[PDB]
């Protein structure tokens, strides 16, 4: 939920920062300079991805042979569909009763 989305956003931001640092290093070392030293840090950012790789290497890996999270748990979804259907049926019955009452006048 929260932690999974946070780690995903963190990995996405890490990839974006790595791409930006690579582009900046290319633009700096292409033409003209001490700032090019920070370009080396871009390579360090690449190592961060490797750490993420390590983070993916020594990750959960529950089975690594099948798919986890058994069951879509959509029984609740089906129950909600039935509830909405009952609500619609009640609305239809109420509309019929209202038409009958209006005809009574």
């Amino acid at each position: 939920n929260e932690r999974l989305r946070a780690l995903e956003d963190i990995e996405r931001e890490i990839g974006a920062i790595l791409q930006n640092a690579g582009t900046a290093i290319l633009e700096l070392s292409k033409e003209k300079r001490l700032l090019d030293r920070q370009a080396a840090a871009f390579t360090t950012s690449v190592q961060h991805v490797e750490a993420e790789l390590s983070a993916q290497i020594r990750y959960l890996t529950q089975v690594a042979t099948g798919q986890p999270h058994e069951g879509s748990s959509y029984s609740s979804r089906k129950d909600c569909q039935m509830a909405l259907k009952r609500v619609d049926y009640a609305r239809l019955k109420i509309s019929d009763v209202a038409r009958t009452c209006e005809q009574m006048l």
Binding site: D79, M82, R86, Y89, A90, K93, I94, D96, V97, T100, C101, Q103, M104
Partner: protein, 69 residues
């Protein structure tokens, strides 16, 4: 007070055919009123059908709730 008043009114109501011996002799225009009554009963039958539809819908809703959790 109202009982005394209605008793006095019933007593003073003895006007015309005062004896009226049909009490011990118990047996052993009106067209407009009858037509109004017929129209009223027709409208009542219509409203009765409407209430029948309403209670059918109510029983249906009760059936839905029977399916509830």
């Amino acid at each position: 007070r109202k009982l005394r008043l209605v008793y006095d009114k019933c007593n003073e109501n003895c006007g015309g055919m005062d004896p009226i011996p049909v009490e011990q002799l118990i047996p052993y225009e009106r067209r407009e009123i009858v037509e109004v009554n017929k129209k009223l009963k027709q409208k009542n039958q219509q409203l009765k059908q409407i209430m029948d539809q309403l209670r059918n819908l109510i029983w249906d809703i009760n059936a839905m709730l029977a399916m509830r959790n």
